[PDB]
Design a protein that fits this description.
The structure is a homodimer. The first copy, chain A, is built from 14 helices and eleven strands. Chain A has a single domain, classed as Metal-dependent hydrolases (TIM Barrel). Chain A is of the alpha/beta class. Chains A, B: Its main location: membrane.
C-alpha cells in the first residue's frame, strides 16, 4: 500500500502527522510562470514556503496534502522543490476548483474523467508526478459543469481508489448535494471528505454527513477576521467566528462518536494571488504560526478541553492514512 | 524601426503580407501543458500548424499576428517552434481576452499595466520573447474588470508604442465604449484596431469608428455556418452570414475612403479547446484553406468586384506594417 507524493510513493507509515487541506500557493493556471514578480519572485515564494514547512515539521508535521488543482495554479515542480528542501512529504491533487477556464468548462463527464485519471495514473504535465487526491468544489447549488466535475471525480476515484476532497459553501449545506451526486455514481462515502465544514456551526448538517460515512474536513481552523478592524475583504474571506469556535467542532464530533471521520487542517498558503492584493500579509498577521497552527495551538487547546492525546493522534495520523491509502472502501 | 516577433525583432520591410488576427491554438492558460492529448498530442498540433502555415506562406503570407493572450493559453515556445519550421513570422500578444482567471480578475489597473509592460518590455514567462501587440476584449457592455483591462492596455501602449487590438460583440457596438475608454486614457485611435467588426453589417457603427481614426478589423472572413445543417454550436460561433457578405465590407470601407484603416484576417486556429469538442473539425470542413483563405479566395473575389491589386496590397502589406510599427501616433 502506497500513497503518491510529489517525490514518489511513500508507505502509509511514512505519512505520519498529516495536514489534509493545505496549499503551497493559491493562484491560477499559468500565473506563477507568467507573473512571478507578483510574489516578489519565484525564489522568494520558494524560500517562504520552505521556512514555513520547516517550522511545521519542527512542530511535528510530516506530510501535507496540497489540494491545489489545475485552476488553483498547482505547480508540482514547485511542490517537489519545497518538499525536498523542507523534508515534508507533499501529496498533490487533481480535480477542479471554483475557477475552471473555458477549456475545462466545456468538457463532458467522460473527458473530465480522462483528465483526472491522467493526473492520477500517468502524471501531471510532463513531470511524471501523480496526484494522490481529487479536489472538487461547489459554492451553493452546483452549476451544471460542477455536477459533471463531481461525477468525473467519483469515476476517477472508483477506478483508482484515490479519495475525493471537496470545497463547500458550508452555510448552504453543499455537502448534501455533493453526497447525492457522489452516491448516484456509486462512490463510497468513506472515500470522500466534505471540506470547509468548520465554516458552519450546524450540527444537524455535519452529523447528517458523518452518519452516512463521510469524512468531515475541519480544515480552516485559524481562518478568522476577529480583531481585524474594518477590513471588508478579510472579513468576507475569513469570517468572524473565532479559531476556538472552529476548533471546538473537533471536540463536538468526537463527543458524537465520529473521531475516526474527522480531518483537521489549516488551509494555509504561502502565496495567494486569487484574492485581493496583500491578503497573504493580512493572513500571516492573523496566524504567524501558519501551517504549524494545528500542532502548536489547536492540539494543546483540545487537550486542555479534555480530549486525550491518543484521540488527537488518531485524528492527525490514523485518519489521514486511512483516507489517503488507495482503496474502494476504507 | 522594428517589430517584435517570437524569433526576435524584424524590420518593417520584413513583415510583408500580414494576417493581423490569427491563432496557432485557441485554448486556456496551462491547458496544453496539462492535457496535450486533447489535441491528439502536442506534436500533432505542431505538425498541423506547420503544414497550415506553410500553405499560407505558399499563398503569399509572410507574417501572422497571433492575438492569443495569457488566457487563450498562448504558448510562445509553441509559436516559436511553428514559426521556425514554417518560415512565417509570428507576432505574439499580451493583454487579456474574455476568460481571465481570478488571479487576473482581482488586479488593479496599475497591476495590469505592470503585467502588460512585462510581456512587451521584458519577456513572456522566462522565454525572453516579447509581445508586439496588446489584445483586449468585451462582449457587450464592459465588466468593471474589462474597463481596467482596456485602461491598462492604453497605458501600456502609451509607454511603448505597441498597438492595441480588440475583441468585440459587434452586434452590441462594443467599439463605441472601447473607444471612449481608450480616449479617456489619451490613446490615439491610430494605435487601435476594433476587431470582429466584420460580424456586423452596421455601416453607421463601422464608419463612426473609422471617422475618428480607428483601424477596423475585418478579421473573421471565412467564419460562416451557412450550409452546416442543424449544428447549433457551430451556428452560434460562426454566424449565418456568408464569407462573401463579410468580404464585401472590405469593399464598402474602401468605397467610403477608409482603405488605409482596414485590417483583414481569417481568425483561424489549428487547435481550439475553449469551445465544443471537435469544433476544429467542423471549422476545417467549412474552410479547408485555413489561413490561406484570405489570399487564395478573398483577394481574387475583391479583384473580381473591382478592387485594384494596388489597393489590396496596401491593405495586406502597408496597413499592417503601419499598425504594428511601434509609435505613439501612426
Ligand atoms: C480521546 C479518547 C476518547 C475520549 C476521551 C472520549 C472518551 C476523547 C479523547
Ligand atoms: C484600389 C485602387 C483605388 C480603388 C479603385 C478606388 C478608386 C479601389 C481599389
Ligand atoms: Zn476551498
Ligand atoms: Zn483550500
Ligand atoms: Zn475574439
Ligand atoms: Zn481571435
Amino acid at each position: 500500500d502506497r500513497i503518491n507524493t510529489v517525490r514518489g510513493p511513500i508507505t502509509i507509515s511514512e505519512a505520519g502527522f498529516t495536514l489534509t487541506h493545505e496549499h503551497i500557493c493559491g493562484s491560477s493556471a499559468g500565473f506563477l510562470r507568467a507573473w512571478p514578480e507578483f510574489f516578489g519572485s519565484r525564489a522568494a515564494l520558494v524560500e517562504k514556503a520552505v521556512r514555513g514547512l520547516r517550522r511545521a515539521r519542527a512542530a511535528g508535521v510530516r506530510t501535507i496534502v496540497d489540494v491545489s488543482t489545475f485552476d488553483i495554479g498547482r505547480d508540482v515542480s514547485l511542490l517537489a522543490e519545497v518538499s525536498r528542501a523542507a523534508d515534508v512529504h507533499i501529496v498533490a491533487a487533481t480535480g477542479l476548483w471554483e475557477d475552471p477556464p473555458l477549456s475545462m468548462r466545456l468538457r463532458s463527464v467522460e473527458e473530465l474523467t480522462q483528465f483526472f485519471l491522467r493526473e492520477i495514473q500517468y502524471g501531471i504535465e510532463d513531470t511524471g508526478i501523480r496526484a494522490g487526491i481529487i479536489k472538487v468544489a461547489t459554492n451553493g447549488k452546483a452549476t451544471p459543469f460542477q455536477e459533471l466535475v463531481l461525477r468525473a471525480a467519483a469515476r476517477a476515484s472508483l477506478a483508482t481508489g484515490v479519495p475525493v476532497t471537496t470545497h463547500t459553501l458550508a452555510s448552504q449545506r453543499d455537502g448534501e448535494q455533493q453526497a447525492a451526486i457522489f452516491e448516484s455514481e456509486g462512490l463510497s462515502p468513506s472515500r470522500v471528505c466534505i471540506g470547509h465544514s468548520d465554516d458552519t456551526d450546524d450540527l444537524s448538517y455535519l452529523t447528517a454527513l458523518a452518519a452516512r460515512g463521510y469524512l468531515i474536513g475541519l480544515d480552516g481552523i485559524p481562518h478568522s477576521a476577529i480583531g481585524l478592524e474594518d477590513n471588508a475583504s478579510a472579513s468576507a474571506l475569513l469570517g468572524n467566528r473565532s479559531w476556538q469556535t472552529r476548533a471546538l467542532l473537533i471536540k463536538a464530533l468526537i463527543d458524537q462518536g465520529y473521531m475516526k471521520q474527522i480531518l483537521v487542517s489549516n488551509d494555509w498558503l504561502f502565496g495567494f494571488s486569487s484574492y485581493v492584493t496583500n491578503i497573504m500579509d493580512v493572513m500571516d498577521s492573523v496566524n504567524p504560526d501558519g501551517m504549524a497552527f494545528i500542532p502548536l495551538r489547536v492540539i494543546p487547546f483540545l487537550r486542555e478541553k479534555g480530549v486525550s492525546n491518543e484521540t488527537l493522534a488518531g485524528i492527525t495520523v490514523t485518519n489521514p492514512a486511512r483516507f489517503l491509502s488507495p482503496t474502494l472502501r476504507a
